[PDB]
Design a protein around this ligand. Structure first.
Ligand SMILES: [Mg+2]
Ligand SMILES: [Mg+2]
Lengths: 212, 222, 240, 235, 233, 244, 195, 204, 231
């Protein structure tokens, strides 16, 4: 798995791979690792697929009940803390979760919270989680700026997953892109790594080690 | 020490067509190197034009199928005989499975049917309830033998159009119900040859707008 | 446990225990709430039947629920403490989980929810208490003033009074308070609050308590001399 | 004294019959169902001119496709609304779909008779639950504290109910538009209200398939009141 | 979680044209000690069902009491208790299957393998298996423990599939069962010569045979076998 | 069933009063008078034992004045047995607070706790309230010397001088007449005894009919001493003040 | 988390806490503030197992804030430290103990004295002139033993603290990404934004 | 790992002629690391003195607990608790945690106010009372203390002689234990006066 | 009089007035008819409306594929009892792979209603039920009273003016019992029976509610234009 999310001028970019493995066996290449909590909030899945799916879907139900009661959009801080407090109750039981709760509100602006099944909860600007996180971090750290355009930021997130997809044996399949704005998230398509790699190699001139 | 889990072998296969869906599964039931039964139905009609199979540990498989069938019944009582849609059934199954998160149903569950637009649908579940709509999914013992073949013959992976040499992919043309059944039968024939836990018989359930139809085929009994 | 249904409907559709709880509020000392343009003022009556009192340590009528919200009341004093305690715990609980202090409306809705719960729970009687909850929402400069009562209903008010002779001071406020132009300054708002209490209080000595709440957790209670200056100015203008 | 769950000689539950008397004292709430949507409207009835009328919340959202109006001891409704919202959201979580308006109403009505010596008395409030689903389309239900709910084409509850219901008897037909229904609620509210009807002491709302449940602005309602006056003066 | 103490070995069974046959030896072993030689492990329920049980004997006795209690309970407020509303093999099995699975799910199993053999109201043959894990399956031939490894192969030579059942008579089926019991006596170190056999026929009803013995055994060839390789004397 | 015999102790009257609280207050009005007077350099607790006998062992007896901790004491008016139940609960709360914060419990926090317990009995549980009114005399480093009172309703208030029990109307007027803010302990001792001497229903006020106590900073340097007066010491102060 | 230091000088308490948050193989954050304000003149820094640290700190914070409102009064640092110790002492014999070590730096407004309390996850409280948790003391205490004086100024305390951090940066294998320093005095709590 | 030897420290108590003495070191540590040189292990409730070695959190917890209990005792009994009674209280309190005990080695010392009789007692972590006439030892250098006390002790020592004996017993024992030392305190207790002396010793 | 304050109190003549008052609620309820032959069993129910705008209150509830009932009285109580029946039918199917006998279903309802008559605090159920079903002993019709009394019958009726329909069935007994293998004719007899209990009002399309169960017929309810055939 490789999942990333980073804050920038134009909001948040969320990018994930699509591979699911059981040991060496590739169970699926078409897995959705972005949970659409609601039209304004996104969550990434790493670690336990069920644990992330179930509890973030559940989180969406809590966010809905909040804004029905309070007649107001739930904050990313509050949403993330509902999840972190939940998993903390289950601490020790064996839940496996590494997720970025991503959102864009008026009072907070674009916000990303790393939430962990150990109970960790961290606000930050850039996060990478999964077996291929170190590869994605390298591309991000070297190329990241706050004043990135929405076009370039989307590419950077795509290219960083590709870097991990290539090197990490347990990452790949395809890249899912999302762009989170104040008015909601916008899906930016599924991108097969196989086709993307040759496309990027040629156009960018990178991956000279690989014969194409 | 008492081990509450066991492996009953078997292999299942769900394929979603354009306006149909098939869920196939061998009829062999085993423990270790012994055959319990050469014909023990594994794929079930659960009503509301939904078919289901919970492959792996047969006791948990049977328990889950029983509980889901029961869920369909109580969905009708509580909601004015409303038809349970395949997507709703899928979410309901997630909650059944995750309900035993810390003592899981040791099964790989697959359901098949038609979505609310009439198109073919297959849903795949892990033992603890993570699920996804899929076009093609083999489950169980010989899943690793079948899925690569399906990637190649259903989705035309790694296949390119002659003359272009790797520049133009083979187009993803729609398969008919007769064409899918051929691939299902050849998948199980091949799995029977190379996997010891697969054999005896193949039972296929075909779901269309007209209803649920069954087809049975012999497999090698060695 | 004790499960007896004390609050129940009568043939005419009334819940007498809730209505008798209001009679306890009617007996309580008068409390008044007036919101200006950039402040809210909570006035409270202190009956002068009790002298030789120690005003340092005696429970004050207005209570802070959080650094930005206050609660005054009329009715049973012992009952009020239970609502105040619950409200203060819920205020910290909200900050802990939502990472943001309560809105005045939310806190009101909670206290009103507690009061309601006691009107249809077995083995309990309703609170003989009506509350005036006032303050400013976090990062907001709009004044808030709410009222609750034993039945559990709550609502927002431009100005409101509760307790004994509240009919009289409400009569005063209804003719003296203008919605189109409320008390623009702290002085004007406090003055109108003191004036409204002087219709009922008797003597303007130690019988009137005033608490001023402003935006951004700015709450202060006026002293005897500060209030006495308002009492002096009001009556001197009245002699004409 | 006497049991809370006691039957009268006529065969009725005393406490349920008495709670119905409390609802008669409550402010008027009217609902009208049409093929273009369901309209809900209420009398606010502020006890004083200093009470900020916009804080009076007698029309409430349960889900995007279900709204709710109340009449009677409105404090009692808060736990009923909470349950309803939870039931609607919970069903969506279990089944990945909207919940049927009838099923929601049935879930609310199950609470009603859970009283004895559970809560100490029945609810002192009636609800008009309006909504839409794909199976039965636009629907309006009347949920009582007896645990019974009736579906209605149109229904009025509260103090001016029997007078308003007689008016709804004559006025309602199966080909009503949404705009016609909006005015009809305002017309009948104005008739049964003690004080003169305006945008501050009365509220409108509706539920449509496209836009879902919406509480009307005071500016929007004010235009519909002005439109009503002119069409009544027109003949 | 426990360990079985006093145990019973193979239960074997098969379908024939008009009904089912089931058999099991009369031994209650205590590890390698052949402790109890008079243990009945076939327990009839009514006149249409026989439940064969292997594994832990204390749990068998508990199950035996549950079935006895089931018959009593069925007769309560039931005028048709000996007619239309009598206990069916399918009712008895489903009850046990439920219990077995519930018990394994509480991590406290009834340490048994059970075969319910009977004939239904409509004359249909019933034969189904359930064990300590709650695993269930049906087949023309069913066997527990060693029977699964040695009896099934022999019984499957008679009824290899569903279509062979109407072709198999009760005499052929009983012969195959009796031979299988002999084979198990030769080869299962925790078996005994004495056994019980039950036939449930749709026409002639339940025939319960006690005190049967393995006979026509081949041992004479043993005299010629000498040493373990090179030894001649 | 049981409903038939239920007095319903926790209900409102049509006028909005709590029947049982009001009747408990009537009970307390027949109890021996207790007086608390707060001075600048200490607090005085004086109380009258109810129609005693000559055979009562006075020196080992205690019905009015009790010790909650080294800093806080109470004067009781009402059912002695009820008071002791509450007193032991108060003693425990003080110790729980001390164990938690490693500091002596502030007087008001203790008073609020007890007063909240009394309140609970009026709102839920269906039991009769405690027929007890306390005068709390205590000291802490925040507010210094403090006098409080609580009654069966659970309502408590702070005082400079206060009475509970019998003839509180007469007693409170006499205290309101002769009390001043700059008063001292020795003067307060005299006022307390003079007030009881006038309001008493007995023919004369004697040492055997009294309990007496003082909370003084009159202890060696910055600390507080509780003094529960002995029978001989009460007899001496009665002669000193010129009552006997 | 890793390193948390504390030093009580003449008229204030200084708490230094590392900024790194590591997760196995990667450093996820290099700007983490491992502290919470319990009351206007009481600050608590913390280090221990992930999740437990913040969950505990915020739970304490809420409780002290609740007490501040109820009594309209700020608890003394000694009182707060005793409350915190009891919670940890209660915690150690629980089903799942809080794995959290804390330093409580406060200024007592009554006594006009700074106070530093060190409490480990077992509930082992000690009042100290300077303190640390984990391996931090092993590198720093020899420097603090040598240079510390009870009459040090705040500026001198910060210099001694820099020397301690430098020794940590030299001899520790782990990169803790520097420290956030905060000062607690009569005027309240403030952060030294350049260190 | 072993809770009774994480923090370290020792207590010793002796009887003399019309007097008792109780003494302790001042070290608190985290195994090898010295953490505090002011951690006193001797407390008192009225005229009854209690030393507690072992796990420091429990030392603190039990002191707070016995303060709690002796304070309620005094309010109800209207008199200060005696050593013999307190000893039984300590025993009861420890044993009620039989299957989850405080990891401590308590030592009671004091003089009975009515009889004037010198009294000392020791306990294991679970409440078993050791009522010795001569001396009681406890802590990580209990073996060393046993050796020192057994040779140095003689009965009916005067207060100022007893001081020397218990001081030398503690000091020389603590110098042979890595987890004890860093200062020491000695209480000399007579019927109506108590002298507390801090000893000078090597600081490692 | 003095002995009707609760269900736990016998009168001097040995009567339970609270149960009798609960019985009275059934008489106030709308009429519903039950009848059966040897092959089929039929429920016919006159649904009641609040007014012309309101819907017609549903009277018939399905318990299983082979069993269901019609109600008369407090509808919420019928929901509780029907729900309990659904569970018991479902318990029998799941645990014993066995359809619940109609007679045994009646025994369960009796015992559930009984507990409410003997204990303090609770109240009797305020509804009467007519249970039809087809099990292993053919067709069945039961009449449930909230006193606890359950009665197996060929035909019956409960509700307001039910005596007229009950007399008709008593005359027609020998005719309708013989209607075997003909569901339409059996329903006709039920519709003709319930017609004897009508005054002023008549059977309209949204007024009538019919349900049937039989040999090769699962329990199915007919409402709306489905019952226009029988008007
Ligand atoms: Mg083979
Ligand atoms: Mg420490």
């Amino acid at each position: 798995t490789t999942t990333l999310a980073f804050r920038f001028q134009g909001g948040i970019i969320v990018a994930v791979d699509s591979r699911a493995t059981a040991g060496n066996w590739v169970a699926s290449q078409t897995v959705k690792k972005v949970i659409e909590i609601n039209p304004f909030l996104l969550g990434t899945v790493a670690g336990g697929a069920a644990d992330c799916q179930f509890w973030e879907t559940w989180l969406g139900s809590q966010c809905r009940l909040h804004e029905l009661r309070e007649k107001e959009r739930i904050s990313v801080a509050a949403a993330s803390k509902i999840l972190s407090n939940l998993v903390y109750q289950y601490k020790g039981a064996g839940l496996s979760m590494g997720t970025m709760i991503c959102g864009y509100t008026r009072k907070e602006g674009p916000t990303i919270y790393y939430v962990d099944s150990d109970g960790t909860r961290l606000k930050g600007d850039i996060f990478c989680v999964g077996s291929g996180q170190t590869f994605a971090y390298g591309v991000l750290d070297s190329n990241y700026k706050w004043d990135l355009s929405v076009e370039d930021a989307l590419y950077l997130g795509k290219r960083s997953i590709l870097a991990a997809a290539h090197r990490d044996a347990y990452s790949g399949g395809s890249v899912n892109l999302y762009h989170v704005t104040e008015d909601g998230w916008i899906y930016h398509g599924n991108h097969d790594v196989g086709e993307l790699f040759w496309k990027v190699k040629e156009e960018e001139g990178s991956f000279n080690n690989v014969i194409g | 020490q008492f081990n509450p889990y066991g492996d009953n072998g078997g292999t299942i296969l769900g394929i979603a067509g354009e306006d149909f869906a098939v869920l196939a599964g061998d009829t062999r039931n085993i423990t270790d190197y012994s055959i319990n039964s050469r014909y023990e139905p594994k794929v079930f009609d659960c009503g509301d034009n939904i078919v289901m199979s919970a492959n792996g540990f047969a006791a948990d498989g049977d328990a889950l199928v029983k509980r889901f069938k029961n869920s369909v019944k109580w969905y009708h009582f509580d909601h004015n005989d409303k038809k349970l849609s395949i997507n709703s059934a899928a979410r309901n199954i997630q909650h059944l499975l995750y309900g035993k998160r810390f003592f899981p149903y040791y099964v790989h569950t697959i359901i098949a049917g038609l979505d609310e637009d009439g198109k073919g649908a297959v849903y795949s579940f892990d033992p603890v309830g993570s699920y996804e709509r899929e076009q093609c999914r083999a489950g169980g013992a010989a899943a690793s033998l079948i899925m690569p073949f399906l990637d190649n013959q259903v989705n035309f992976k790694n296949q390119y159009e002659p003359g272009t040499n790797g520049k133009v992919k083979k187009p993803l043309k729609y398969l008919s119900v007769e064409e899918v059944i051929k691939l299902v039968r050849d998948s199980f024939t091949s799995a029977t040859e190379r996997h010891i836990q697969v054999g005896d018989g193949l039972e296929i359930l075909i779901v269309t707008k007209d209803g649920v139809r069954k087809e049975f085929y012999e497999l090698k009994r060695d | 446990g004790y499960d007896r249904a004390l609050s129940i409907f009568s043939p005419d559709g009334h819940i007498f225990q809730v209505e008798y709880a209001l009679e306890a509020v009617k007996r309580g000392t008068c409390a008044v709430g007036v919101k200006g343009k950039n402040c809210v003022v909570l006035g409270c009556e202190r009956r002068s039947t009790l002298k030789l009192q120690d005003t340092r340590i005696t429970p004050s009528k207005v209570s802070k629920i959080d650094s930005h919200v206050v609660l005054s009341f009329s009715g049973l004093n012992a009952d009020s403490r239970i609502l105040i305690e619950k409200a203060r715990v819920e205020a910290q609980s909200h900050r802990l989980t939502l990472e943001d202090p309560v809105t005045v409306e939310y806190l009101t809705r909670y206290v009103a929810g507690v009061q309601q719960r006691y009107t249809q729970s077995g083995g309990v009687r309703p609170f003989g208490v009506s509350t005036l909850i006032a303050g400013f929402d976090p990062r907001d400069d709009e004044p808030k003033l709410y009222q609750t009562e034993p039945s559990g209903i709550y609502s927002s008010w431009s100005a409101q009074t509760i307790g004994r002779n509240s009919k009289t001071v409400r009569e005063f406020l209804e003719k003296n308070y203008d919605r189109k132009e409320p008390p623009a300054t702290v002085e004007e708002c406090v003055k109108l609050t003191v004036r409204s209490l002087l219709e009922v209080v008797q003597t303007g000595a130690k019988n009137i308590e005033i608490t001023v709440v402003k935006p951004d957790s700015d709450i202060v209670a006026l002293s005897s001399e500060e209030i006495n200056q308002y009492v002096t100015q009001i009556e001197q203008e009245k002699q004409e | 004294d006497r049991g809370v769950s006691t039957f009268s000689p006529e065969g009725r539950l005393f406490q349920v019959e008495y709670s119905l008397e409390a609802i008669k004292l409550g402010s008027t709430a009217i609902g009208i169902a049409t093929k273009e949507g369901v309209v809900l409207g209420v009398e606010k009835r502020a006890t004083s001119p200093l009470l900020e009328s916009d804080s009076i919340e007698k029309i409430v959202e349960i889900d995007r496709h279900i709204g709710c109006a109340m009449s009677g001891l409105t404090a009692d409704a808060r736990s009923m609304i909470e349950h309803a919202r939870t039931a609607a959201v919970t069903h969506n979580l279990y089944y990945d779909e909207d919940i049927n308006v009838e099923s929601l109403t049935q879930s609310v009505c199950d609470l009603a008779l859970r009283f004895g010596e559970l809560m100490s008395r029945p609810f002192g409030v009636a609800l008009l639950i309006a909504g839409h689903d794909a199976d039965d389309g636009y629907q309006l239900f009347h949920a009582e504290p007896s645990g019974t709910f009736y579906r209605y084409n149109a229904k009025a509850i509260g103090s001016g109910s029997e007078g308003a219901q007689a008016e709804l008897l004559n006025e309602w037909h199966s080909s009503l538009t949404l705009k016609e229904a909006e005015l009809l609620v305002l017309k009948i509210l104005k008739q049964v209200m003690e004080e003169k009807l305006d945008e501050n002491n009365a509220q409108l709302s509706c539920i449509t398939k496209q836009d879902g449940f919406k509480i009307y602005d005071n500016e929007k309602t004010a235009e519909l009141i002005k439109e009503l006056k002119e069409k009544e003066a027109a003949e | 979680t426990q360990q079985p103490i006093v145990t019973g070995t193979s239960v074997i069974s098969m379908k024939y044209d008009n009904g089912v046959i089931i058999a099991a030896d009369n031994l209650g072993s205590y590890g390698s000690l052949l402790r109890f030689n008079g243990v009945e492990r076939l327990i009839p329920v009514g006149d249409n069902t026989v439940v064969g049980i292997s594994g832990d004997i204390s749990d068998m006795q508990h199950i035996e009491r549950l079935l006895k209690d089931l018959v009593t309970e069925n007769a309560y407020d039931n005028p048709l208790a000996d007619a239309e509303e009598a206990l069916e093999p399918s009712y008895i099995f489903e009850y046990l299957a439920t219990v077995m699975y519930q018990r394994r799910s509480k991590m406290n199993p009834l340490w048994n393998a059970i075969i319910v053999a009977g004939v239904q109201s409509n004359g249909d043959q019933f034969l189904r298996y359930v064990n300590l894990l709650g695993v269930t399956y049906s087949s023309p031939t069913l066997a527990t423990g060693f029977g699964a490894h040695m009896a099934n192969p022999l019984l499957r030579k008679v009824v290899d599939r569903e279509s062979d059942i109407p072709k198999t008579t009760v005499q052929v089926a009983e012969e195959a069962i009796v031979n299988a019991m002999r084979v198990l006596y030769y080869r299962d170190a925790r078996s005994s010569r004495n056994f019980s056999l039950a036939i449930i026929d749709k026409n002639t009803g339940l025939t319960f045979k006690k005190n049967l013995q393995v006979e026509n055994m081949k041992w004479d060839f043993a005299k010629d076998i000498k040493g373990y390789g090179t030894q001649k004397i | 069933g049981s409903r038939r015999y239920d007095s319903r102790t926790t209900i409102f009257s049509p006028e909005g009063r709590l029947y049982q609280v009001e009747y408990a207050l009537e009970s307390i009005s027949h109890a021996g008078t207790a007086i608390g007077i707060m001075a600048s350099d200490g607090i005085v607790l004086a109380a009258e034992r109810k129609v005693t006998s000559t055979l009562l062992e006075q020196d080992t007896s205690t019905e009015k004045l009790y010790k909650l901790n080294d800093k806080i004491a109470v004067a009781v008016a009402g059912l002695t047995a009820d008071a002791e139940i509450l007193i032991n609960t108060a003693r425990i709360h003080a110790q729980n607070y001390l164990k938690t914060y490693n500091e002596d419990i502030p007087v008001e926090i203790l008073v609020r706790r007890l007063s909240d317990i009394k309140q609970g009995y009026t709102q839920h549980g269906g039991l009769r309230p405690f027929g007890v009114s306390f005068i709390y005399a205590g000291y802490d480093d925040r507010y210094g010397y403090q006098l409080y009172t609580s009654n069966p309703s659970g309502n408590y208030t702070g005082w400079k001088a206060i009475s509970v029990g019998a003839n509180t109307s007469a007693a409170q007027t006499l205290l309101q007449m002769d009390y001043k803010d700059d008063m001292k302990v020795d003067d307060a001792i005299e006022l307390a005894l003079k007030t009881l001497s006038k309001t008493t229903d007995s023919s004369a006020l004697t040492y055997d009919r009294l309990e007496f106590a003082t909370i003084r900073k009159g202890a060696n340097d910055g600390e507080v001493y509780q003094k529960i007066f002995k029978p001989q010491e009460i007899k001496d102060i009665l002669v000193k003040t010129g009552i006997t | 988390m890793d390193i948390i230091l504390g030093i009580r000088v003449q008229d204030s308490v200084i708490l230094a806490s590392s900024k790194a948050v590591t997760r196995g193989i990667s450093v996820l954050k290099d700007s983490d503030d491992k502290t919470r304000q319990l009351s206007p003149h009481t600050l608590m820094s913390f280090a221990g197992e992930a999740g437990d640290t913040v969950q505990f700190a915020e739970y304490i914070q809420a409780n002290i804030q609740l007490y501040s409102i109820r009594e309209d009064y700020e608890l003394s640092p000694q009182a707060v430290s005793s409350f915190v110790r009891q919670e940890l002492a209660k915690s150690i014999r629980s089903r799942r103990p809080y794995q959290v070590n804390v330093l409580i730096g406060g200024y007592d407004k009554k006594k006009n004295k700074p106070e530093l309390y060190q409490i480990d996850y077992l509930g082992t409280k000690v009042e100290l002139p300077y303190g640390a948790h984990g391996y931090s003391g092993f590198y720093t205490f020899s420097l603090l033993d040598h240079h510390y004086r009870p009459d040090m100024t705040t500026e001198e305390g910060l210099d001694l603290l820099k020397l301690c951090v430098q020794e940590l940066e030299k001899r520790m294998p782990m990169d803790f990404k520097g420290v956030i320093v905060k000062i607690v005095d009569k005027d309240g709590i403030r952060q030294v934004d350049d260190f | 790992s072993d809770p009774s030897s994480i923090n370290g420290g020792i207590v010793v108590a002796m009887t003399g002629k019309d007097c008792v003495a109780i003494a302790c070191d001042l070290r608190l540590g985290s195994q090898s690391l010295g953490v505090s040189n002011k951690f006193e292990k001797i407390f008192h409730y009225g005229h009854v003195f209690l030393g507690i070695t072992g796990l420091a959190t429990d030392v603190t917890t039990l002191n707070e607990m016995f303060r709690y209990k002796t304070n309620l005792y005094k309010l109800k009994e209207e008199r200060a608790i005696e050593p013999e009674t307190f000893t039984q209280l300590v025993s009861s309190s420890l044993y009620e945690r039989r299957f989850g005990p405080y990891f401590v080695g308590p030592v009671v010392a004091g003089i009975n106010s009515k009889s004037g009789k010198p009294f000392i007692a020791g306990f294991d972590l679970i409440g078993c009372i050791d009522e010795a006439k001569d001396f009681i030892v406890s802590g990580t250098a209990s073996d060393q203390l046993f050796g020192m006390c057994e040779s140095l002790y003689e009965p009916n020592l005067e207060p100022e002689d007893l001081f020397e004996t218990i001081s030398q017993a503690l000091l020389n024992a603590a110098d042979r234990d890595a987890l004890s030392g860093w200062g020491a305190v000695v209480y000399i207790i007579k019927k109506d006066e108590v002298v507390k002396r801090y000893l000078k010793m090597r600081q490692d | 009089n003095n002995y009707d304050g609760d269900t736990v109190t016998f009168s001097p003549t040995g009567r339970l007035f609270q149960v009798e008052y609960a019985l009275e609620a059934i008489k106030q309820g709308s009429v519903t008819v039950g009848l059966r032959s040897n092959t089929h069993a039929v429920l016919v129910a006159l649904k009641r409306n609040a007014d012309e705008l309101s819907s017609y209150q549903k009277k018939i509830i399905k318990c299983d594929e082979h069993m269901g009932l019609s109600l008369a009285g407090l509808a919420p109580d019928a929901r509780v009892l029907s729900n309990y029946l659904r569970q018991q039918c479902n318990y029998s199917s799941l645990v014993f792979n066995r359809k619940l006998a109609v007679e045994r279903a009646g025994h369960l309802l009796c015992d559930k209603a009984q507990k409410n008559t003997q204990s303090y605090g609770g109240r009797p159920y305020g509804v009467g039920l007519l249970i039809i079903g087809y099990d292993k002993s053919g067709a069945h019709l039961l009449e449930f009273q909230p006193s606890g009394n359950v009665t197996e019958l060929y035909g019956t009726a409960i509700g307001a003016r039910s005596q007229g329909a009950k007399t008709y069935l008593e005359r027609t007994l020998d005719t309708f019992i013989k209607i075997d293998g003909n569901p339409d004719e059996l329903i006709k007899a039920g519709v003709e029976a319930i017609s004897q209990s009508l005054r002023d009002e008549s059977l309209t399309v949204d007024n009538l509610s019919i349900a049937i169960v039989g040999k090769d017929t699962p329990f199915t309810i007919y409402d709306g234009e489905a019952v226009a055939k029988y008007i």
